[PDB]
Amino acid sequence: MAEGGAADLDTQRSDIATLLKTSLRKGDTWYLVDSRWFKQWKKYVGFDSWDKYQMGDQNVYPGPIDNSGLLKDGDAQSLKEHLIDELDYILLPTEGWNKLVSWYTLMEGQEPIARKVVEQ
């Protein structure tokens, strides 16, 4: 078990994997993550099963979660139009986001983008 603070990587990827399979609850509040940070994270953490060459690597260390690519031109509180799920962004449950923010926090100048569960 590594990391005195935060979770072990073996733990990180797997615990969050648990959050993706986790129920969303109609009327709940999820939080967006840019897919790129998370995809970077997958490498680093060994989330993606073929891609554990970067596992534990510092090269692939995803620092603070950066939703700037999701955020509109001018407003950090405004999401862009073409945004879709893991294709563009991702959502985490409260915990999921909390984890990621507990481990690597959120970028400076940003706020969590909370997305209610879809009405579809």
Side-chain angles (χ1 to χ4, degrees), residues 11 36 88:
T11 284
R36 297 178 168 157
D88 220 302

Side-chain angles (χ1 to χ4, degrees), residues 65-104:
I65 304 168
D66 179 51
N67 298 273
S68 301
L70 309 181
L71 305 177
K72 269 185 164 184
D73 299 276
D75 298 81
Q77 318 299 153
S78 304
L79 295 300
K80 294 185 179 182
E81 298 295 273
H82 298 244
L83 281 56
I84 299 183
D85 181 4
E86 72 89 83
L87 306 188
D88 220 302
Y89 58 61
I90 316 184
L91 298 305
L92 291 318
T94 287
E95 307 297 285
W97 171 255
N98 284 333
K99 276 164 204 283
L100 304 174
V101 164
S102 189
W103 305 336
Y104 285 98

